[PDB]
Amino acid sequence: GLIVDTRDVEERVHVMRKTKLAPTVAHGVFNPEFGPAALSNKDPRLNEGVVLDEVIFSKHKGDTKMSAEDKALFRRCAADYASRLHSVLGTANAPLSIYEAIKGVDGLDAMEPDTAPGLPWALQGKRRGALIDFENGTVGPEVEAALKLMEKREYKFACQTFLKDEIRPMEKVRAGKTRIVDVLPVEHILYTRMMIGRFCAQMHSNNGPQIGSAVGCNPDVDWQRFGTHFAQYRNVWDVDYSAFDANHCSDAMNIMFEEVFRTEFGFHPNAEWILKTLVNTEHAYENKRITVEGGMPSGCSATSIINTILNNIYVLYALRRHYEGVELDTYTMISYGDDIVVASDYDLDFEALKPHFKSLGQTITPADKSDKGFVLGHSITDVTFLKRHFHMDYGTGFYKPVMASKTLEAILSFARRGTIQEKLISVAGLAVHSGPDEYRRLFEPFQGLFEIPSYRSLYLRWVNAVCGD
Amino acid sequence: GLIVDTRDVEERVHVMRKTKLAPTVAHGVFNPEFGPAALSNKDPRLNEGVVLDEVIFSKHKGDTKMSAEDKALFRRCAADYASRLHSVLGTANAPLSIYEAIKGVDGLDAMEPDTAPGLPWALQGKRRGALIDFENGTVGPEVEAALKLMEKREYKFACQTFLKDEIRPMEKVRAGKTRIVDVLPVEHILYTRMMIGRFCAQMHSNNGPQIGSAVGCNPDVDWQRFGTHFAQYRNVWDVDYSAFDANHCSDAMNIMFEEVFRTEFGFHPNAEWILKTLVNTEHAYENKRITVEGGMPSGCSATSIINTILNNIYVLYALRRHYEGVELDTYTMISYGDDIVVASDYDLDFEALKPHFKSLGQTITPADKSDKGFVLGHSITDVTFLKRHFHMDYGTGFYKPVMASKTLEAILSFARRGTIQEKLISVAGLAVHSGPDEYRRLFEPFQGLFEIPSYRSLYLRWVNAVCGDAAAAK
Amino acid sequence: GPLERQRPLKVRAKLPR
């Protein structure tokens, strides 16, 4: 997006911030090229000339203007994807009640009772519990008043910007490339769930290549489904974007909202409106108020679903901008936000699509960095999706999600204080798919300090999960 | 052209039915897949179903009537080419005297004293020498009477059809693809030379890509000039036409004559008229008189020059019919009748020009049989022009004209009785460019039977000719 | 340079195999 204004404000947000992540005994064995993101400008790991509070917003380099011809093409691509999407999901998209939106429904989890409430509540020392009764699914007068302003389309808000406390490549750490999450006001999340909650539930329930979305998938059980599908195609591509969320242009976002969330598909007319409030946003970071035009705020309600929808439309747009006679049957894809696998029996020239994605303000490169160029004849057993390869399990004849050993080593090398035993059991569920030898090697550092599940026990648990599905 | 009438008449115009081209000592060594064209319908080498008398006229498949749009485009292309031509040559296009037309001038060879006189003289048993004094450059009363009728635009004539006695690929011989020479009356040739002889002389003297004509070139010296020019362009194309001369439509011939040979460019008014006599022609073959509309008669005074001019206009027309903003500087070309090399720094789509040439009644194909479709990225060293490749000589860095060894074998394998010594010295001048090993192999059958010029003598003669032309330019 | 007379304003490639 374009940063159109930056100004200093007295009602500041946070205090001095330290990572909750600490190294484990694995760090000294694996020596990963990863570390906790810098959460302070005074972090001594930061390179000379790094201003953390600037670098975190440096992805906002402008709002790409699309030509009239490109806007018209994008609207047809948005309409064509929307047609497929609502054909699969149906048009049961009526608004949820306040109760249903707080409590969730089949395919949509309940709202979090004690996560950040956003602004201005955070500055008033209010938690979510002071504004909403999560047990009874009711709202106090503050949220009720805000909901009435949204009904009238008069609601205005700021996004509360937090640094992401997480493991990053050391190159990114030293450059001050700490990722951020935007906390929108709890009432904005509430109303968004009211407007598109049934839709999001249907997206989760129907995840797969037919709607081009993996949002709500379970990799353990769904890799068999996804792997079987993509194995049928001559060519498979995994595509990398640079700052996907930030570089969604206003033109693209507005057209996508207009075509996907139409009243004729069963949406309340304010579904389009509440989504369009994401285009021009104010971001509160410490004492800074930053106004941005374009880009998706990272961590608003339905971020994953919105980014996934745009990813689907971008591929149809880019192929149709380059090639004659492209339809939804020309290729298949699945996306989770910026993450994407595309496949076709056609020898599609993905290298030639680079300038077409650039018309959208998006920069694509191969996910496989062993070359800066796209090639033909890659298979499902070559690509990475959600940091997982597709490997055929010898024992079952089912695809399993296999993470790179370098990824698992980095994950095992850090943990929030007092969480190591819990984390090891969680990571064991990821590592089992690497096979018994690599599983044994990855957990060797922890033997005698923590209970490590046997490879055998997690393998049999997995077999039951995939045979059960 | 279109055959609009075929009738029988009393007086038979006889045709030579026996070849004069006998096998040489070389024939038994090379066993060439070439032989003399069939001159008789009874030739036993002809394939089953071949009627020689029919096949030789089968090139006459019609006279394309061009659209209003296309005639307007063609006229502006002919005018643009004429502007270029007359800008390079000047407009001193005054008629040659009778004397000049017979004896020739700088850039125009004398008329041949003892070639066929054409009709009606052939039927009267009269030779050229009985009608014209070639030594003193004067005409007898018969020719002077005909020249008076041409001045008054009342002259009428018939073309005499000769079968061409020549070596052809055996595939073409067996198919009955014997070529025709149209012999025009000697007085018609004389008056054409009077009307446009100066212009033809200027074309010969100024041959090159600037006027798009190689007519009157000397391949030994001019391959260096032509090669160096075409070497500078990204794309080069050699184009093959099907029966080029026969497929010139009346509309294209008439419009070209009107735009090139104008009085405002210094031509006598009868320059346009005498050329327009070539459009609607009567052809005498045995007892047959065949009336044809359209097509250039094959072997008139200025056939090569007329064909070359049309070839230049056809390329401008085709490119302008397909593309916006095409001008004479968009491409470069040189032509010798139907033979053509085109080049451009632009990726011109010659495959796409096929239907545009068809609108003129002309069928173009690649001269190369690696593909039936035209492609980009060919160079001057890939093309054939006047049956010669452009090869860089190792000794000099000069382009030399190299003929196919199989063709040189074929030329050496046949000769008219008593002409072998003369022919060997002639062909030696062609074969030197194949290099010393191939030169030796080609003449080895004749060793100890005839004088064979030393490779070295002909190589040094050639180097001196190209160097002399360069030393002159400096 | 020279541009085609009959080309549309959609200079898009054919799908390969």
Q: Is C4's Cβ below 8 Å from some Cβ in B?
A: yes
The residue assigned the tokens 């080498």 is B45
CA distance A118 to A13: 10
Backbone angles phi, psi at B287, to 5 degrees: -95, 0
> What is the number of alpha carbons within 13 Å of residue A21 lying toward its C-beta?
19
Task: Please indicate if any CB of chain A lies within 8 Å of the CB of C7.
Answer: no
Query: Are residues A269 and A163 both part of a single domain?
Result: yes
Strand pairing partners for A7?
A289
CB-CB neighbours of A31 under 10 Å: 10
Catalytic-role residue among A338, A339, A393, A437: A338
At residue B171's C-alpha, the angle toward residues B168 and B173, to 5°, is: 50
Residue in C12, C15, C17 to test binding to A, most A beta-carbons within 10 Å: C15
Q: In chain A, how many domains are there?
A: 3
Residue B180 bridge partners (DSSP): B163
Chains that touch A (3 or more CB pairs under 8 A): C
Q: What are phi and psi of B268, to 5 degrees?
A: -55, 140
The last residue of one of the domains, among A379, A403, A427, is A403
C-beta atoms surrounding A302 within 10 Å = 21
Eight-class DSSP state of A65: P
Secondary structure of A267-311 in the HEC alphabet?
A: CCCHHHHHHHCCCEEEEEECCEEEEEECCCCCCCCCHHHHHHHHH
Tell me which residue in C10, C12, C16 faces A347 most closely, judged by beta carbons: C16
List chain C residues with CB under 8 Å of A349.
13, 16
A323/C17 touch (CB, cutoff 8 Å), yes or no: no
**Based on the domain organization, do A164 and A126 belong to the same domain?**
yes
* Other beta carbons within 10 Å of B114: 9
- Both B137 and B186 in a single domain? yes
Rounded to the nearest 10 degrees, the angle between the axes of helix A303-322 and helix A68-89 is 120
Q: How many CB atoms lie within 10 A of CB A448?
A: 6
Q: To 5 degrees, how large is the angle CA B203–CA B204–CA B210?
A: 55
Of A33, A28, A49, which is closest to residue A173 (Cα–Cα)? A33
Asked if C9 has any chain B CB less than 8 Å from its own CB, the reply is: no
Contact list, C10 vs chain A (CB under 8 Å): 324
B338 among known catalytic residues: yes
- Other C-beta atoms lying within 10 Å of the C-beta of residue B54: 10
Indicate whether B231 and B185 sit together in one domain. no
* Nearest 10 degrees: Cα torsion B291, B294, B298, B302: 120
Residue A264 and residue A199 in contact, taking contact as beta carbons nearer than 8 Å: no
Task: Give the containing element (helix H, strand E) for B392.
Answer: strand B388-392
Distance in angstroms (rounded) separating the CA atoms of residues A220 and A432: 11
- Chain A residues with CB-CB distance to C14 below 8 A: 323-325
Bridge partner list, A283: A159, A290
Contact list in B for residue C3 (CB cut-off 8 A) is: 323-325
Distance from CA of C15 to the nearest CA of B (A): 21
Q: How far is B325 from chain C (nearest CA, A)?
A: 5
Q: Are residue B285 and residue B399 in the same domain, yes or no?
A: no
Q: What are residue B252's phi and psi, to 5 degrees?
A: -65, -45
Q: Helices (DSSP H) in A286-412: which residue ranges?
A: 303-322, 354-358, 405-412
Task: Count the Cβ atoms, other than its own, within 10 Å of residue B234.
Answer: 13
- Last residue within a domain, chosen from B369, B403, B437: B403
Cα of C1 to nearest chain B Cα, Å: 7
Distance CA B458, CA B452 (A): 11
* Among A339, A294, A348, CA closest to A321: A348
B324 to C3: CB separation less than 8 angstroms, yes or no: yes
- From B213, B236, B246, select the one nearest B350 (Cα to Cα): B236
Strands B399-402 and B388-392: what pairing? antiparallel
Show which residues on chain B lie within 8 Å of chain C, measured between beta carbons. 319, 321-326, 330, 346, 348-349, 352
| Residue among B322, B331, B342, B345 with most chain C CBs within 10 A, to mutate | B322
3-state helix, strand, coil in chain C (%, to 5): 0, 20, 80
Distance CA B56, CA B442 (A): 33
Q: Do chains C and B touch (3 or more CB pairs under 8 A)?
A: yes
Q: Kindly report the nearest CA distance between residue A333 and chain C, in angstroms.
A: 18
Name the experiment that determined this structure.
Answer: X-ray
What resolution in angstroms, rounded to 1 decimal? Answer: 1.7
Write out the E strands in B88-223: 132-133, 138-139, 159-163, 167-169, 180-183
Residues B215 and B336: beta-carbon distance below 8 Å: yes
Pairwise CA distance, residues A337 & A308, whole Å: 4
Interface mutation vs chain A, best among C9, C12, C14, most A CBs within 10 Å? C12
With beta carbons less than 8 A apart as the criterion, state whether A222 and A209 touch. Answer: no
Pair of tokens at residue B466: 């190209």
Q: Say whether both A439 and A364 belong to one domain.
A: no
Does the beta-carbon distance from A330 to C14 stay under 8 Å?
no
Spatial neighbors of A243 by CB under 8 A, at least 6 apart, are A59
| Distance from C-alpha of A463 to C-alpha of B274, rounded to nearest angstrom | 98
Tokens of A384: 């990475």
State the Cα–Cα distance between residues B27 and A457, nearest whole angstrom. 91
Q: Are B116 and B191 members of one domain?
A: yes
Say whether C17 and A322 touch across the interface (CB within 8 A): no
Q: Do chains B and A touch (3 or more CB pairs under 8 A)?
A: no
List the structure tokens of B340: 């053509």
Query: Are B317 and B464 in a shared domain?
Result: no
Domain range for A435 is 404-469
Question: Which amino acid type is present at position B279?
Answer: V
User: Contact C3/B322, CB-based, under 8 Å?
Assistant: no
Q: Contact A324/C13, CB-based, under 8 Å? A: yes
Q: Where does B14-81 show beta strands of DSSP type E?
A: 21-23, 34-36
Q: Which helix (H) or strand (E) holds B427?
A: helix B420-431
Tokens at A124, concatenated? 């008033």
Catalytic residue among B43, B182, B222, B338: B338
Q: Are strands B332-336 and A332-336 parallel, antiparallel or unpaired?
A: unpaired
| Cis amide linkage into residue A32, ω under 30° from 0 | no
How do A159-163 and A280-285 pair as beta strands?
parallel
Burial, A103: exposed, middle or buried (Cβ in 10 Å; 0-12, 13-18, 19+)? middle
Identity of the residue in C10, C12, C15 whose CB atom sits nearest the CB atom of A346: C15
- If asked whether residues A325 and A391 sit together in one domain, one would say yes
Sequence-distant (≥ 6) Cβ neighbours of residue B259 within 8 angstroms: B75, B78, B79, B81, B82
Chain C nearest CA to A243, separation (Å):
28
3-state secondary structure string across A180-238: EEEECCHHHHHHHHHHHHHHHHHHHHCCECCCCECCCCCHHHHHHHHHHHHCCCCEEEE
SS3 B280: strand
Contact B325 C4 (CB under 8 A): no
Closest CA to B393 of B238, B224, B226, B218: B224
Dihedral sign from CA coordinates of B81, B86, B89, B95 = positive
CB burial of residue A461 (10 Å; 0-12, 13-18, 19+): middle
The answer to whether residues B162 and B263 belong to one domain is yes
Antiparallel, parallel or unpaired: β B280-293 and B2-13: antiparallel
- Return d(Cα B301, Cα B111) in angstroms, integer: 9
Distance (Å, rounded) from C-alpha B230 to C-alpha B390?
Answer: 10
Select from C10, C12, C16 the Cβ nearest to the Cβ of A346.
C16
Query: b or e along A138-163 (b: 16 or more beta carbons within 10 Å of the residue's beta carbon)?
Result: ebeebbeebbeebeeeebebbbbbbb
In whole angstroms, what is the distance from residue A455 CA to residue A462 CA? 11
And the tokens for B8?
A: 């029988």
Same domain? B416 vs B314: no
> What is the C-alpha separation between B424 and A450, in angstroms, rounded?
102
CA angle B437, B438, B439 (to 5 degrees): 90
Smallest Cα–Cα separation from A364: which of A342, A394, A334?
A342
A80, A316 in Cβ contact below 8 A?
Answer: yes
Distance CA A297, CA B231 (A): 60
Residue with tokens 């035009």: A293
**d(C-alpha B474, C-alpha A450), whole Å:** 95
Chain C residues touching residue A326 (CB < 8 angstroms): 15
User: Which of A268, A287, A302 is the endpoint of a domain?
Assistant: A302
**Rounded CA Rg of chain B:** 23
CA of A254 vs chain C CAs: smallest distance (Å): 25
CA distance A30 to chain C (A): 45
Half-sphere exposure of B450 (CA within 13 A, CB side): 19
Same domain, A69 and A184: yes
CA–CA dist B191, B169 (Å, integer)? 37
Q: How far is CA B453 from CA B404, B419, B420, in A?
A: 20, 16, 14
| DSSP secondary structure, B355-372, as one string | HHHHTTT--EEESSSS-S
